[PDB]
Structure formats: C-alpha cells, structure tokens
Write a protein that binds this DNA or RNA. Structure first.
Lengths: 231, 292, 93, 164, 310, 292, 93
DNA sequence: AGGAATCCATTACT
DNA sequence: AAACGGAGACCTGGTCTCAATCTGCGTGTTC
DNA sequence: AGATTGAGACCAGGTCTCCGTTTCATGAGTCTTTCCCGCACGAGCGGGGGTGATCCC
DNA sequence: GGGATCACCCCCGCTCGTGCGGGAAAGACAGTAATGGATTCCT
C-alpha cells in the first residue's frame, strides 16, 4: 500500500534544475554546521538556515569554518563551494554531479582532443564575445556560478580550450567569456556611484546580483554551452 | 614523484603560521603543507577558510571522504594544478583504438594469463561476465555460503539474502576511495572505457581491478558469519573500513592507474598514506612536530 | 514562479531541518517555497514518509478559481471541498 | 466508537492522469461481519503494478464493474463513521478528489492515519514498511494486496495498536 | 485612514467584484460569528469562510444565521440568498460596496424615458441573440419571442439529452416540481441568481427597477439574469439530469458543474461589462474624491459640509 | 392599509406549522406570519430557514437593524413585494419639475413659520444654514453648553470637543431608523433629491427633516449632563434608543415619505410600531398564543 | 497573482478570527491567501494596528531570484539581507 | 532389449 | 571531532471553561 | 440571547542539556535502442485596453 | 469642435502545440549451465 522508496537524502530529481536555483550567496566570519539535517551558517548575533537546494554556488570568505557533514550535505544538493579571499579566488570545491548523462562531457572530450575541433570551438568562442576589491567581488561571483553549472552537468573543468594546463582550465575559458560583458559596466558603475561609510562588499555584490538576474545570464549558461557543444 | 595522502579523523584543522593544526583531543599537530599533496578528511572534522587558503596556493588537494575513504563526498583542485593526467586520459576514450588498448589492459590486469589482444569490448564484457560467474560460483561454496543468485535492488535493498546487502555494501565501499583518489589524481569519472554513459563510467571501469580481490572475499566473509536480526550492510561496511586503513591497497590504485594511463615510469608518481599517530617517527625528519 | 508552503508540527527535528534545504522557515514548523510543480511532490513525498508522527499540511498555487488548493494528512484540520473549493474542517471533540 | 477500514489501489499517483482500480472496505466496530469488496473494469494497466500484483484487462472485464456505481455504494456505506486505514490519508485525498469528478457529494470524516501513530513508537529512521510494522506487532501474515485480506490485516493492526 | 476595528473594513481593502469567487452552499448547519469570524456550525465541526472571496453565500433548508452573523457578512458585501425547495424563498443584502452611485442614477433616468427604455430593451435582447434584428418591435412581443426562444431552446436541449421536459418553464416565483429533472434545473438556476444578486448591490444598482420585468421588488435581477440563463445554466442543468443516476444527490453534482462553466465562461468579466453596455456608461477614470454632493440645477453640484448662511 | 413594523430582540425565530414562532429570552411568541409585514431584527437575534421560507411567501420585509433600529446593517425584500413607491420615487427624482417640488416640500417642512417655496434654492441653503446655526445657538443657551463652531473629522472620532462628537454620534443613530424604513418600504437609498452622489444621498436628505427636531437637542442634552472621559459615542446611542422606544418617530416618518412623494391618500400605507410585549392586549384579539 | 502567507504568535484572538474573512487557516496561527499588491498591504495595516504586543510575519512574491520577499514586524525570527536574498535570521542563546 | 550411464545436442540462464 | 537520538528537563502559547458585560466602530450646513 | 473580554487553569508541544553512539543506510559482470513519460519552449492568439479613426451634437 | 460612434493597433496574459531531455523497459551481446535426447554401455 505505502510503496515508499528510502528517504532522508535527495535524488537529483528532487533537486530543482540548475536554472531554477539562485546565483550565489556570500558568507563571512561564520561557523558552518549541520544540525537536524540542515546546513546552518552561524554568526555571532545568530544563525541562518540557507536553502541549499535553491542556490547554485555558496561562496565563503575569510575567517569562516565549515564542518565535514556540511560539505556532505551540500554535495547532496550539488551546490558548489568556492573559497573567496583577498586578491582573487583562492581554492575551489565541487560535489560529484547533477546530471547522469555524460553526453556533454563525451562531446567535450571530442572537441578537446582533436586539434581541429579545438579550433572550431575557439572560433565559435569568439562570436558571442563580440576598486580592486570591487572588481574582484564581481569575478569570484562569476567564477563561482559558472563553476557550479559546469560541475552540475558533469563538464570537466580540467579540459579547457584557451586557458589550459591547470585543473580549473575550462572554467577560466567559460567564465571570461562573460566577464567583459556584464561585470565590467557594473563594476564601473560601482566606482562612479560610490560613497564613504557604505558596505562596499554588501553593495557591490548586491548590484552584481541584480545584473545577473536581470540579464538572464544564468539562462544563457546552459544554452550557450549546449549550442557550443552541438547538443 | 612523492605524494602524501593524509587522513585526519575526529579533529579540527587551522594553522598557526604556515602549517595545519590538527585539533584532536589526543594532541596538537603542526604538519607543514609543503610536503602535503592530498588531504583526506573524515567524518566529524572542521576546516576554516583561513586554513584552506594556503592549501589552494600551494597546490594541494582537499577531498572530503567518509571513514578513510569508505564513501566519497566532495573534492577540490587536483595536484599542483596539473592536468598532465586528464589530458592523456582525455585522448584515450575518444580514440577507439586507444579505447581498445586501455580496455584490453583492464582485462589483462584482471587476468594476465588469458590472451586479450584479439578481444573487443563485447568479448571483454562477455569474458569478464563468464569469469566473474565462475569466480562467484567457486568462491561461494568455499565459504559455505548458499548463493542463489546475484540480484541487486537499487530501490529496496533491504529485502533479500544477507549476501546481497553485504556484497552491495562491499561493492559501494570500494567505489568511495577509488573515486576520491581519482578525483585527487585529477581524472573525471565521466570518461569510461568499457562502461560508459554515466557519471562514474571511469570508476566502474577502474574499480573492477580490485572487485575480485577485495570486495567479494570480504563480502562473503561477513556474510558467512552474518547472524539473524543484524544490519549485514553495516557490518560489511565496518569490515571494508578496516581493510582500507592499510595503504597497500591505496598504493595500488595510484600505481595501477598510472600504468593504466600509459604514464612512463619517469612520470609515474608513487604515493603512500601518512598516519598522524602512526607515522610520527618518519615525519619528524620532515619537520612535523607533535604536542600533547 | 508558483508559490507553495508547507507547515509542520510534532515532527522529528531531522525533518524540521531537512526541508530548510528547500524551503525557508518563517516560524515554528511553517515553510514557504517557489518550486516547479515537479519539485512539489518530491518534497511532499519526503514529507509523506519522513513525517513520522505529528501533523503537517501544504498549500500551493492551484488552478482552482480561488488560487490555491489544500492537502492535509492526519490533521484535526480536515480539508473538505465545497463545490470544487478548498475549506478547513475542524471537527468538534 | 465506530471506524471503517478502507483499502484502495490506483494505477498511479496523479489526480487527473490516474484512475481508481479496486475498492474494498470493512467497518471495524462492534465485531459484526459485513465484508465487502468491489472492482473496476479497465483496459490499460501500468507495467510496474502489473509485475507487483498482476492486473490485466481480461480480469477487469470479467470481474470489475462500473466506476460510478461502485463509488456510489462506497459513499453510501461510508457516510456513518470515520475512514481509517494504513497510510489512509493519502488514499482518502485522492478518493475524495475522485468524488469531485463524479459528484458524489461532501465527504465528512476525520482524515486521521493509522501509519502515523505506528511510526511514533520508533521515530528512529525516516522510512518504514508494512511488513516492518506488522512483524513488530505479531502480524506474521504478509500482503495479499486484495481488499478483504488487507481489510482483516488492518483490522488486526487496529486491535493490536489501539492508540485511539 | 481611520482605526481598524474587528469586524469592519472599507471598500479599498476589499477586492473588486471581478476578483471574487462564485458562491458557497450550506445544508443543515448553523451560521454564527464567533471570535469575529463568520463560521458554519455543521453536524461534525465548524468551518471559517473567507467572506471577502465570496460573491454570495447560499442558504439551503435547515440553516440558521444570527443577527451578528449577518452584520459581519454585510460589511464585505456578500449577499444572503435562501434557496430551499421550490427554488429561492427570500433575498437579503447589505450596503453597496462601491461609494460612487453613478450607476444607480443612470438606471433611474434611463428607465423613465420609454425611448431610452425601448433602446435598452433592444440592446438587452441584442446580446441574447445578436443574429437577429430587433430594432423595431415593442415590449409586448419581446416576452413572446424571448420566451419562444427560451421554450424552444429548452425543448431542443431536453430532446438531445433525452430528458423528457414537462413543458413547465422555470418560474422562480413559486417553482413547482419534484421529479429529478426539476431540482436539477432549479438548483442550477438559483446559483446564477446569487451572483447576480450580489453584483447589483456591489455596483449599487436598484434590484427592483427593471425594464423587461416589473411588478415585484426583485425585477431588475430577472431582466439581467435572463442574459445568461439560456446560455450558461440551462445547458449545464440538462447535462446533469441526463447523466443523473438513481439514488444520488444531483444537487451537489449539478452545483459543481455550474462553477466549471462559471470559471471557463469568464462570467464576472463579461457580466460586469454587460451591465455597462446596458447602462451605456461612458468610460472615464473618475477619481470621485468627493462622493457626496448637493444637487444644484442652476450650477451642477455644490459640495457638502458648508454653512451657506454667511 | 396597515403595516406592522414589529421589532424583536434577543430571540430565535422559526416556524412550527404555518406561523412564525419567536423563542426569545423570557418566553416564546407565536405571532402569525400574515400579520408580519415588516420585521425589525435587533441585536442577538437568530433566524431559521423554515421561518424565512414562510415569511418569504408573505412578502414580509426583512431588515437587520440595531437595538430598536438604532443602526442599519442589511436588508431583504420590500414590504409585500411592492415597488410602486420606488417607481414613483424614480420618476420624481429624474424630472426637475418634480425635483423642485419635493425639494421645496422638505425645505418647507423645516420652516413651519416661513413659506420660502417661491425663492430659488440658492439662498435656501443660506436660509437653512441660518436656521441650524440659530438652532445650535439657542440649544446651547438652554443647556449652557459652550459652542463656537461645529468641527469634526471622520478619521478622528475621539478628538475634538465632546459636543461635536456627541452631535455626530446622535446623528448616526438617526440614520439607522430612517434607513431601515426606506429599505423595508422599498425606497432606493442612492436616489437622493438634495444630496446626490453617495449611496446614502436620500438617507441624509430624509433624515434632514428630523435633524432640528430630535437628534440635535438630545445630543446637546446628553452632552450637558455628561462629563469628561465617558464614551459619549455609546451614551448618545443609548438615549437616542430611548427616544425610539415609543416608536412615535417611526409613525411620523413613515407617513411623511409617501407624503413627500405626492402619493394619493389611498396609497398612504401606515406603519404601526407593534411590539410583542409592549402590545400584549393588542395582539391577543387576532388569535396569538404566548409561552413563558 | 502573487501569493500571501501570514503567521501569528501571541496575537489577540479578535484578529485571529477576523483575518479568517480574508485568508484560510492551514495551521493554527498560520494564514494564507492569494491577493494583489494593493489588497495585501492594506491587510498589513489591519494586523499592524491590532496585533499590539504580538508577533506576525508575511511572505509575498517579489522580483528576487528566490521568488519572494519577507515581511516581518515584532517577531522572534528576524530577517537578514544576504546581498538581496531574504533569509530567516533566528537569534540564539 | 531395456535400461542406464554417457555424451552430445541443445535450450537456457548469468 | 561532529551529529543524531533518546530521555530527561520545564518551558508557554494556545485551547478551553467560567462569569461579566454588551448589543456595538461615530463627518454630510466642519471651516 | 448571541458575542467579546478577561481571569482562570491547562498542557501539548517546542526547546534545552545530558547522555549514549555512531561515523551509515547500501547498484549498475553491459551498453544500446526504443521507447515512453515530461514540463519545457515558442507562438498563436483575444481582447480589451488603449489608441485612433469616424459619427453625432 | 466636443462628444458620441465605430474601429484601429499592441501585446500580453492565456492557451496550446511540439518537443526535448529525460524517464523505464526491453532488447540485445557472449560463453557456460543445465536439461534432454542420442550414443554407448550394460543385464
């Protein structure tokens, strides 16, 4: 009568699509824990219960600490973890996957080993192509979300096209494809529209968040990769 | 050439100046990260953003695992930001001739005696099925284990003979550490050779190098002594956890994969685990100091 | 995106935190969420079994001319239709 | 103190995309026997339920009856006391929504569920099973998946449990 | 604004008439206002009705409502209709929700002029049957022809569904009939009456000032109820009777099929628009910050609250 | 042509066989349904459906009113289902020839000592404005209550001097009774002759004939004896209830309405304030039974 | 049409029964309905001037990727702005 | 000669 | 070391019954 | 008589630390093909609202 | 000319259609296992 599958964890089907989830969250000076099967970010004033399912990448800044079971719980959702620090990003993290079909990866493999195939993607790369702490915050937000979607669909960050030779080579090829488009005009606006006594970390990330949702850049992540991979 | 796979359990980690600080109740550790290549984390451990930062800039590998790798949870950047291994791993799957050679080597790694060059994927898949069926059959009566059949239920594993969960638990146990190592090594599990079209396609084509050697002997072992009214799965998991503590199995995957990926012995990078409370004597010359 | 809300009480603390991965928690045992209709049953199916003893109910965007529909299980607040209209029934003790 | 043990099974889960298959029920009060069951004809059966229990168009035509009359009789004899059963709230939700399609009327009963009270005495894990609960209370008989067998099974379950 | 007191609210808070549900049915239950909540005391328990989302709250046989309960319903403009056997028995309504009364003044000035009355009577019949030209004939044979179309429509629908028709036409004034066709159609029609009863009060239209029907205090409803009875409820009512089986509460089944027609028919948007067409109200965004005024034939309308002595 | 304006309070009303039975606090009344032409339902009164069906057939007018009709909440059908008064009302309001005629007729009723029918209404408000100002001053002199200028605020009821609050409170009590009779008899509240543009335009116009006679002096009287702090809003309501207890004002206005509408003497239907317990000997000739 | 969710802790019973005329009560002290932007805000003006010493919070659909914005007055579970994303702040011991 | 053990033929299952 | 789960611990916001008091929430000649 | 406010008693249930106990809940010796289910997308369209012309004063 | 009457878009909510990327579900792929008949041996 009941006919019930085992529960207490989550199958990727129960997770919303990589598009439905939000762009990113930023955390500072917090101790992340997993209480009552819930990921929590603990601040001095109090704690907050992040909805990991509805968020793509969860950035972490200086002076924050994360428990092991928290990383396990985030991996179930598959949300990516990015340790953001001073002067650019420092280290990356990821779960295992969100889609069980390796078609994009297999096609990604085909387009990376064949040198002529690399030239095709590189030529295809060019068509849709055409203060430091403020610009850095825009980069890492861009880096985190594009890493999450790449890791969500199983694409290999190691296999890049232009940026190559490092474990996150593909991310440095897909992230900069949009850096000069969205972040740069937003970053310039932050510098021009600036005032003393305002939280630059709060304000800069707030505006970049609006630009991403307004520009439907998250919508473009899946489609641009899919059309570039002929899938 | 030298890679260290340290496994910390039941402790926190920070730094003081440039070395990680294990916060176990037994003592205080200050292992420098210069010699650290891969850092495995077990259940009930903490790691701070300020500690992680040096790990990223020194090109180490942060990998969250279960108890000494019984299950894999998450990983990070591979060794020293080096993709010399995945790039070679990339060009093998795309080329069928390379895929024939790699798949053939996989079978001959399992059975060096049998001739493999004339065989193809279907031959390898068929012959392996014939071999494992023999291996299942002959070893079943060796442990006085009545084996009716191998049936695995992906949804409801609870209903069945004790071997099934035990074999499944033993099977999934090995899947963990092999996934963590290959992620640490820097090969995505997507690129399978015999198995394909799955997230862990490369895992299911690599774990078979040890399924007949580790999983099945221990699966029937716990099944033979399995008693009524017990979580055979949990007992099998505990036994697999004890087997993994020895790093001799771990030394094989790092060695076998490098051989499997046609890496020259000059480019082959051997590795070994470094226990915190059991390798103190040899880590002292390396600059590791201990406080209680 | 359509809105759905789930309430809980007298349920194991694991569930009370598990849904927080998906749905925010305004107060004690109440949740809100904006999920696709496909995601709704998956969360509810978990709630269908992870519930344990206690009491729970769910509201969501619906095509009924009010705008919402009601789901209650072993609740003192039984849902009864009134000519295709969701209403809360409170039987007297 | 009067209750009705109801057990039904559908060809799926969706409200509009699935249909009731079998309806059988017994009132468990004062220990008098009025065992009732019913069946519905049909022509399409999903493979999963086909392998789990076994249902075919030939069976439905030779034994099953009209949906409307069976539902009318059900509404007729469930109008006095509450509806009780294992995991019964989910079944009653769909059954009452089915009365909306055929316009049976306003079902008025407490949506209390036997399974929820059974889960209470353990509260250990997040998943429970019928044969797990039955063996916990000395009910060795397994699931016949039929109306009257499950009816008497839940009757014994109610006699053993008695949380009400 | 003023303070908010439990049980009262203004029109601005309440949603417009076009953003409200159809109706509720209640049977063998008591209505009471407990803890400032409109409630139904049924046999088993209680239920709180969100009256703001209620066009009209129908009352079947064996229902009771207290004085305080009516007051709560009257604040939100929900009409009260008592529908027992033999159709509806009585009507009830509260204050007009909308503060302007320009709809009401047009109705009075239009009904007096027979030329205006005739043109509206021709406008009202045009919506019923746009395929016909009726810009010539006068009232005495509108009842014949509108009636003939109604009688013929009833006959054809009955034959198609195969339900025998006694030839007795639905008369809300002392309806008669007990056969399953009777309460099937009678209950269906009174559902249409309830929504119409509230909206005329909601927009501030006099219920007793109608064109085609005169001679009783609820005339205007009958004239505008006919605008959709032959297009909505009659097709639904006969469908229920044809599929009706022995020993089933067809009133419930019939009542449900109405709302499906009501929602899909887009009646609220259509029906409110139709009253505008009948009244020929010009379209303009009237602020009406000054609702009340003093009549002044010489100079339009002078405001209020002024002592004109000095 | 007698209309029974029966008022009932604290009662539950149903029917036994064919007559309305009233189950009030201190007994049970069984008034026949034929007598009930217009019912005044006071606070805390319950109605049964069968009684509604019985009273729906007789054309009885059902109006939900406050204590002794102090405040009006909702109304049902008109008296005896008649609509002649409403129709005549519509004709009179539409044409100026009749609009002036009734306008002078009410204005004359407010000036018993002066005939100003021939003077244009432009100064009639000026003439009326002087009268109320004269009435305000002389009433203030009699009760020695200071009075400078009536100032009020619909959004600020509590603020301001008590007399304006008391005067405003008493006026609302007056609208309730007059709005009850017009709804029961079938007048349209929207169709106002002098006031126009609001749904109560007639109500303020018809009650304007009783501004200077009852509501204003009572408000001045009660405020004179009232001191600071007391809720004059309810105090004014309760005393206006006392002035409505007799029902003489009920008879006075019910005759004035159709008199204002130029209804012929034959059409002058009279409302008699019958009461269940205030007219014990008056109902018993008709054959009514009483229960205690 | 955006969805509205209402919660109440320690509020006078008059408002608890009065607001039922707009929302249905899925759970005790928890109310929900489907209004527009104008009507919902006026219902805030009702609760804000009758709750007194109490606790109330609401959620309604908004132009944030989470899909809803939090509204709260005098509640234990405050709201904290995480770069525009409304998340429940719960003070601790 | 008949059955029975053996072998082969063969379907059948892992 | 984390986290769950249970068994305690006592918490309080809600439900309920009980008299007591109330019939109700108020601009239209206010500038 | 029906309803609200308040005081009164109640207490189930949320919350807490303490204590014990785990380190988890369990597949894929074979992929391939052909399927089915989906809500996803665009895009068609009604439908009036707004806008724009003529039509009537 | 203004209001009154008859028609203009836009376009956007609404509806619907395919349809795509996912199911699940079978159906393929090889050597042995197992069964039975033919062969051979045995009474």
């Amino acid at each position: 009568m009941a006919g019930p599958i085992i529960a207490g964890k989550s199958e990727s089907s129960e997770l919303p699509r990589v598009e439905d989830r939000a762009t990113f969250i930023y955390i500072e000076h917090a101790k992340i824990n997993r209480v009552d099967s819930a990921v929590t970010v603990a601040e001095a004033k109090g704690v907050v219960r992040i909805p990991a399912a509805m968020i793509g990448v969860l950035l972490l800044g200086p002076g924050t600490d994360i428990s092991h079971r928290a990383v396990e719980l985030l991996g179930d959702t598959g949300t990516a973890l990015v340790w953001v620090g001073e002067q650019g990003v420092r280290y990356y993290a990821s779960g295992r996957a969100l889609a069980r079909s390796t078609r994009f990866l297999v096609k990604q493999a085909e387009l990376v080993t064949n040198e002529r195939s690399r030239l095709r993607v590189a030529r295809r790369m060019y068509q849709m192509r055409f203060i430091n702490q403020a610009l850095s915050a825009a980069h890492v937000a861009l880096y985190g979300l594009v890493h999450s979607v790449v890791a969500a669909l199983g694409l290999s960050p190691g296999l890049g096209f232009v940026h190559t030779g490092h474990d996150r080579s593909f991310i440095y090829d897909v992230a900069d494809l949009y850096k000069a488009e969205i972040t740069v005009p937003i970053a310039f606006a932050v510098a021009a529209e600036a005032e003393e006594g305002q939280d630059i970390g709060q304000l800069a990330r707030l505006r970049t968040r609006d630009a991403f949702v307004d520009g439907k850049i998250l919508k473009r992540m899946v489609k641009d990769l899919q059309t570039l991979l002929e899938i | 050439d030298r890679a260290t796979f340290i496994y910390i359990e039941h402790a926190k980690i920070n730094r003081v100046d440039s070395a990680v600080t294990v916060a176990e109740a037994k003592g205080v550790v200050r292992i420098p990260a210069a010699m650290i290549g891969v850092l495995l984390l077990g259940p009930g451990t903490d790691i701070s953003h300020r500690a992680v930062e040096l790990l990223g800039d020194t090109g180490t590998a942060l990998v969250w695992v279960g108890e000494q790798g019984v299950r894999y949870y998450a990983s990070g950047r591979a060794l020293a930001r080096s993709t010399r291994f995945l790039v070679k791993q990339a060009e093998l799957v795309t080329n069928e001739r390379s895929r024939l050679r790699v798949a053939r080597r996989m079978y001959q790694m399992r059975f060096p005696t049998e001739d493999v060059s004339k065989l193809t994927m279907q031959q390898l898949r068929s012959h392996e099925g014939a071999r494992v069926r023999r291996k299942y059959r002959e070893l079943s009566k060796k442990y006085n284990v009545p084996w009716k059949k191998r049936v695995y239920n992906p949804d409801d594993f609870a209903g069945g003979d004790p071997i099934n969960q035990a074999l499944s638990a033993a099977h999934v146990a090995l899947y963990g550490l092999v996934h963590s190592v290959v992620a640490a090594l820097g090969l995505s599990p997507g690129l399978g050779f015999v198995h394909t079209g799955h997230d862990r396609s490369f895992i299911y084509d690599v774990a078979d190098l040890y399924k007949a050697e580790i999983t099945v002997p221990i699966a029937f072992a716990v099944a033979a002594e399995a008693e009524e009214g017990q979580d055979i799965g949990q007992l099998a998991r505990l036994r697999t956890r004890d087997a993994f503590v020895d790093g001799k199995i771990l030394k094989r995957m790092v060695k076998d994969l490098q051989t499997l990926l046609e890496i020259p012995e000059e480019g082959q990078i051997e590795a070994e685990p470094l226990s915190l409370w059991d390798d103190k004597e040899k880590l002292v010359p390396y600059g590791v100091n201990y406080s209680e | 995106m359509p809105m759905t809300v789930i309430t809980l009480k007298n349920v194991p603390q694991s569930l009370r935190g598990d849904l927080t991965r998906w749905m925010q928690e305004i107060a004690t045992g109440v949740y809100v969420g904006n999920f696709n209709s496909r995601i709704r049953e998956y969360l509810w199916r978990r709630v269908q079994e992870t519930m344990g003893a206690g009491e729970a109910s769910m509201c969501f965007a619906a095509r009924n001319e009010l705008g919402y529909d009601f789901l209650t299980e072993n609740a003192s607040r039984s849902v009864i239709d009134y000519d295709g209209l969701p209403l809360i029934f409170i039987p007297k003790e | 103190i009067r209750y009705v043990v109801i057990d039904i099974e559908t060809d799926g889960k969706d409200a509009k995309r699935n249909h009731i298959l079998e309806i059988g029920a017994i009132r468990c009060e004062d220990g008098k026997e009025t065992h009732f069951t019913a069946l519905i004809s049909g022509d399409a059966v999903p493979p999963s339920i086909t392998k789990l229990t076994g249902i075919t168009a030939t069976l439905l035509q030779k034994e099953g009856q009209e949906e409307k009359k069976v539902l009318t009789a059900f509404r007729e004899f469930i109008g006095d006391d509450d509806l009780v059963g294992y995991h019964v709230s989910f079944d009653i939700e769909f059954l009452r929504q089915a009365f909306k399609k055929y316009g049976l009327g306003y079902l008025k009963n407490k949506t209390h569920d036997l399974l929820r009270i059974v889960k209470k005495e353990q509260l250990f894990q997040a998943d429970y099973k019928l044969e797990t609960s039955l063996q916990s209370y000395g009910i060795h008989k397994k699931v016949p998946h039929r109306a009257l067998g499950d009816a008497e099974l839940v009757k014994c379950l109610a006699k053993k449990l008695n949380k009400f």
